[PDB]
Design a protein around this nucleic acid. Sequence first.
RNA 1: GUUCACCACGGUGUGGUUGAUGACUGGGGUGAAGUCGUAACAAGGUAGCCGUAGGGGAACCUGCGGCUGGAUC
RNA 2: GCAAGCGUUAAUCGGAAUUACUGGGCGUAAAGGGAGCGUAGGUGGCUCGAUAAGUCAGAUGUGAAAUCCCCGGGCUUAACCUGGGAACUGCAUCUGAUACUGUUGAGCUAGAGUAUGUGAGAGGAAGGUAGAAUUCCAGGUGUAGCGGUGAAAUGCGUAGAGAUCUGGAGGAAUACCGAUGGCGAAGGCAGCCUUCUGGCAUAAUACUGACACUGAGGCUCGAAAGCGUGGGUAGCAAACAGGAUUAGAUACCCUGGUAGUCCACGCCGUAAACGAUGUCUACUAGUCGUUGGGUCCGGACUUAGUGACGCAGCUAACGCAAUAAGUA
RNA 3: AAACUGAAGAGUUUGAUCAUGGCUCAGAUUGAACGCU
RNA 4: GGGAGAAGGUACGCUGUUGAUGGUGAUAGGCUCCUUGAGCUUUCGACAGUCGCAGAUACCAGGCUGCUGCAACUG
Lengths: 61, 86, 131
Amino acid sequence: ATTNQLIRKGRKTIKEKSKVPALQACPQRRGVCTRVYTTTPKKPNSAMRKVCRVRLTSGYE
Amino acid sequence: MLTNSDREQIIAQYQRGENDTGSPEVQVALLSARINDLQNHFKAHKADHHSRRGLIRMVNTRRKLLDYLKGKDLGRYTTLISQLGL
Amino acid sequence: SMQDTVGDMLTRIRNAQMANKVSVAMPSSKLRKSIADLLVSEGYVASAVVNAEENNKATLSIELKYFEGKAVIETIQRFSRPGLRQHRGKDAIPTVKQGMGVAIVSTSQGIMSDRAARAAGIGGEVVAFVA
RNA sequence: GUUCACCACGGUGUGGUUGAUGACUGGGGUGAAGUCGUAACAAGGUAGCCGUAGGGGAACCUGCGGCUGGAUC
RNA sequence: GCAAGCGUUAAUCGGAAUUACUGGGCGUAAAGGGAGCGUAGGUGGCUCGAUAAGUCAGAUGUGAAAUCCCCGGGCUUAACCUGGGAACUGCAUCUGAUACUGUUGAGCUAGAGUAUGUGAGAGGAAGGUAGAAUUCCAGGUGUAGCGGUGAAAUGCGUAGAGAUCUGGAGGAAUACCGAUGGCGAAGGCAGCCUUCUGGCAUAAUACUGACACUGAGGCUCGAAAGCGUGGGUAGCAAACAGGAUUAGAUACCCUGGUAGUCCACGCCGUAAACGAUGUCUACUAGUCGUUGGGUCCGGACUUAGUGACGCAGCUAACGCAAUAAGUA
RNA sequence: AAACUGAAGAGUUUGAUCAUGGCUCAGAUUGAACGCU
RNA sequence: GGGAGAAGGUACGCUGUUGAUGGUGAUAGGCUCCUUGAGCUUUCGACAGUCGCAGAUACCAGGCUGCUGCAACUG
């Protein structure tokens, strides 16, 4: 990466998206539970973990 | 090809000085003669790419010398290309 | 092609010093001779003489120094290459090894040391760092 | 006042760009006491891989050219 | 451990040298474009002058205040408020300097080229031709097998095979030489001869006088397979048919076999297109081969390649090491 | 007089190692929300 | 090549003024030539007015799109 190449093209820092899109950059968000169920974990662990499918005011389910 | 005799004829015609054989004028004239003579070879041998590579290099060298001569003295360049039909 | 004459001269000095050569010769120029004169005056090389050869040519010959087995020039790096030139003001010249080294500065008053340019209150092209 | 000019709303037609949805369909992933084989790793039991073509339930196979990132020689 | 707060979530920078300007890499970890020619652009030899655009310095004007930082001052302290500075890396205009870059005048030959003589080469293109061999066709001799495999079988043969001898047709490739040998930008290029033709290597003299390097886009060329059209078609052989092996065997092995392989003209534009190593410069212990030259006295030196080692240096290590992956 | 003072790493690929390389963490900040107080 | 006149729009009469323009050539000047151009005639426009429900006013004179089967098409 020569000086001429850096001035012509540049450096590029791609921007990582948020891991919590449904909050829409909010601390919390209100929803209604559309389902309250249990599920089994990944390979090392075993349990009946309690999950709820919830539709938020942000339009995500 | 071009014989020694006609190569020397071109040299003598385009001598800027005595027995110089190295100025842009004589170089460009000799390249022009060689290209115009090789046109005969490449009309009968179209798939001679290995020879065409060298002819293209001749064209490139003549273009470099013509641009250098134009940037050096424009009267000489406009005279030379008028003599050679370029 | 060769497009850095100062960098070529510095690389010649560096390579000869790594090879424990007594003296290094190169095609001479006035800028090269000035840089060699600054090196001599700084005490990094023993001497630098220009021998005028034929065909309007000249050879710059530099006698190198070695102290306690090691080379006197610990490091010599070009700073302002042709592809990126560096010019600094009087209070912006980089210090080399806290001042125990030399930053070769080509100023309007000639090519001098970074400390000389600071004393003169002057700036210019920072061409090399020699320590 | 009348009339013409300019012009906002509004209308008409024909396209462009783009979001959501769509029977069905393609590959991608995840999931366990599954089915069929065993392709790769050792010379992996026909050395492997690359481009390309043909063929095949499926890993793949075969031709041509190439590579060593191949044992043994 | 914090404390009238303490945790969690969201969000930004940091740590992250993890986009590296400061400040990273690309042989094998991700990463050199298949190769070249070249446009814009970037960069660029020596000497004497001019110029002062860049650059450097100075002056002047401005860069609001607040904020930040420094020195103080006022709230009981602090937060807060406040006086003066410093700073605001900036811009503009003048003045000065000319080392470097930029623009220019002149000159120089060391980079790059030209003319002239020799030399090597599977460099390219178009024709022609030779000899071994295979296959087929037709005959002579001859008789019961041949062929194939780890074994077999399919297949061929009593309509006479296979073997042997003699004639004919046809296509393709060019044994030995043959060589980490040569030539070519790569891709590639081997019988021999001619014609057309490119580059290179080498000696000396004369000449031009920076004409250079690299190169986004662009263009050209670019194995094999494949595609179009028209030919050709011996061998080989995808597909395909059969025989084996196997539990199966859409394979490996066997017998056959069409496209293709060959030619002409066009496409295609891809390969582990590899040295997994961009091009071009300069510099840095040495030793031994080899190809084409050159100069000396069978040796010595020097050149352009092409190889094997091996210091320093570099590398995660492997290793590279003047044909660098060293120093720039 | 002064404005001129500033730079830490850890865990996690392996039987183990070095490298590469991502992910994660310790900091600071907020017009914040939420939970407990 | 086309599809395509795809689809779909706008103008269009008369009167006056006015710009340009092709042809033919009287008339003068030097079976012919050149310049000039009377008269006649051609083609585009511009501006201003004007009447009606309506100006391609009558006769004359394509309807047009979307999906899909078949056959290449003219014959």
